[PDB]
Symmetry: C4
């Protein structure tokens, strides 16, 4: 019931139900997310920006609210939104 | 004597005495906090905003001081305060 | 040669030599730091503000430079400086 | 294929291929990075500023983009850039 997402060493844990809410996104779509799955460690690994992920995960947890972390530059954050397919 | 609170993968450790200071809150009230207790991992798990929790825990540690993290948006933070019942 | 400081669940690792640089401080003075030592886990535990500690540790690592983290309020940070005896 | 960089207790994980992109830097040059390698723990250890490292790692991940974290002071960050040899 609980998924582990490893973003460059920073582990995030959430419920599969939280991700499946938006099946139109990378993390909400099994076919897409599975290419990042590590069966040895049983977690999804992304070699990407760590600070931006708090806002990405919150998008799912809040049911669709997206807020840019002030500490994260606008151009860095927009690239992440595009990668995770939230737009 | 020490409690572990797991907020979306981010572990916080504090003393039970620190939480019991405010028995009128979610974390200070055994009946409320226990529904989030995971006996397998022996920790309380919250699938919620990670950045906001530093200020939530500090509220207990400082004996009642609540300060909003600049890096956390006002509307996101207020929802957390309501959830943890600090108001 | 390496010490582990656990601040409310957030682990920091540094070298004993880095702390001993300022023997006039809490962390640089064996008699003071030892009352926070946990022999079971072999780490020093502080049930205190997590965000402020990055600047506290950097004080030792930089050889005396103290900068307040913008994300940490001035009154919260000053209380930490007083506790760790850096002034 | 995956490297672990331990910055004062904060673990970062990336791919060796991500670092080797810039062989002219500390982390991209085997001869330089190896003096910080810990064979016992199998990770590279740096007793340095933690907040600055997110932007340092992102430099490699983004293929050369360097942005200063607002929460990190300009003079602290510049010292890190010099140490990791990104300039």
């Amino acid at each position: 019931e609980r998924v582990v997402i490893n973003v460059s060493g920073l582990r995030f844990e959430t419920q599969l139900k939280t991700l499946n809410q938006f099946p139109d996104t990378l993390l909400g779509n099994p076919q897409k997310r599975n290419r990042y799955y590590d069966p040895l460690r049983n977690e999804y690994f992304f070699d990407r920006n760590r600070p931006s992920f708090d806002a990405i995960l919150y998008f799912y947890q809040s049911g669709g609210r997206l807020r840019r972390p002030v500490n994260v530059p606008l151009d860095v954050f927009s690239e992440e939104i595009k990668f995770y397919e939230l737009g």
